[PDB]
Amino acid sequence: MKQLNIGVAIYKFDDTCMTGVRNAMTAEAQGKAKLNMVDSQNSQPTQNDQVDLFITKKMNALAINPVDRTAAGTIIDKAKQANIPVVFFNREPLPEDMKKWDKVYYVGAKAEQSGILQGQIMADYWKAHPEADKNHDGVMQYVMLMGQPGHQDAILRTQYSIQTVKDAGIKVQELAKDYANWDRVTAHDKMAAWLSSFGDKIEAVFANNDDMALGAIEALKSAGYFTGKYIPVVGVDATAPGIQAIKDGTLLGTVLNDAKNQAKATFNIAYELAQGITPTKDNIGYDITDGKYVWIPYKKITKDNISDAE
Ligand SMILES: *CC(=O)c1ccc2cc(N(C)C)ccc2c1
Ligand SMILES: OC[C@H]1O[C@@H](O)[C@H](O)[C@@H](O)[C@@H]1O
Ligand SMILES: [Ca+2]
Numbered sequence: 001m002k003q004l005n006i007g008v009a010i011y012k013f014d015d016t017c018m019t020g021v022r023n024a025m026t027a028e029a030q031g032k033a034k035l036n037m038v039d040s041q042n043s044q045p046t047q048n049d050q051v052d053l054f055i056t057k058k059m060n061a062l063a064i065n066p067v068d069r070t071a072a073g074t075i076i077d078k079a080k081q082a083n084i085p086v087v088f089f090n091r092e093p094l095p096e097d098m099k100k101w102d103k104v105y106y107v108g109a110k111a112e113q114s115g116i117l118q119g120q121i122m123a124d125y126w127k128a129h130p131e132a133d134k135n136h137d138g139v140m141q142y143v144m145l146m147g148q149p150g151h152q153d154a155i156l157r158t159q160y161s162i163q164t165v166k167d168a169g170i171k172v173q174e175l176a177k178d179y180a181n182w183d184r185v186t187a188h189d190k191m192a193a194w195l196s197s198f199g200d201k202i203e204a205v206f207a208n209n210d211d212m213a214l215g216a217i218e219a220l221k222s223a224g225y226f227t228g229k230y231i232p233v234v235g236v237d238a239t240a241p242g243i244q245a246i247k248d249g250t251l252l253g254t255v256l257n258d259a260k261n262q263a264k265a266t267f268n269i270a271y272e273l274a275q276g277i278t279p280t281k282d283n284i285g286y287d288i289t290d291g292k293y294v295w296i297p298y299k300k301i302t303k304d305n306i307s308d309a310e
């Protein structure tokens, strides 16, 4: 067969979710196309250099997980000039940037949905457990661990999780919120400081992803929770360690971020484009929305259906 080369840039390799995505992409590509996969080390200048090299090396298609998703416009400019099609994934280009060229696609998921499902987990717990309102004021005191500033999943999961709790008829009070950039250790450090400041005032913890929820859980353990003393913590992704924390009883719930189907859709699009074929639902195996987007559903995960994540 003809060798097809796809340039793949991952925003950083030390991201738990994106490790799942790139491993699944590598599995899908086996026997079909050569992935030239690089680590952008959470640096857009690094990724810009990598994209330039992909283009110089005449990749047949690009699959880019952009560090700064607002940089997708400049990446599209370069790709258009080189006539190399590009699919973006997981970090979403701005909608007007997507209209710059007709060989540009995006694969991801509707972050609003993951926020809603998060909020439902917490609201349902709150309604079933009167003891959760530790200061008996009829208000849920919570803290919020956000992802990276400006990332669409951080913006939308933060907004929709809490709006969903309010929509469920529950009054809320935000004690603290901060960016922990999807990182376990940073979330741990933020949560530890909050526990020193506010202590038993905290009644609920929301995190935009599992790694941050897990860091929060470690700070909570250190402060005496989850032995004997309980607090509900919710995340997003249903990674292997997230699933383990659900089983341990330390994570109340999460939302499956379907890396396997996002990887398949991304690969399939890049593979068709590498062959000079326009993606269709028939030839990539997924619905295409607004001519450019493939949205993969999120799914609620608690101890009640932990096998749905496995
Ligand atoms: C990218 C993402 O969110 C995600 C979700 C789940 C997930 C699970 C696993 N295993 C169960 C091994 C690996 C990666 C992964 C990533
Ligand atoms: O872009 C990276 C981020 O993507 C999000 O969709 C995932 O939930 C996070 O775990 C990940 O760090
Ligand atoms: Ca309260």
Ligand SMILES: [Cl-]
Pocket (backbone or CB within 6 Å): 184, 185, 188, 215, 218
């Ligand atoms: Cl930690």
Ligand SMILES: [Cl-]
Pocket (backbone or CB within 6 Å): 258, 261, 296, 297
């Ligand atoms: Cl799917």
Ligand SMILES: [K+]
Pocket (backbone or CB within 6 Å): 225, 226, 227, 228, 229, 230
């Ligand atoms: K406990």
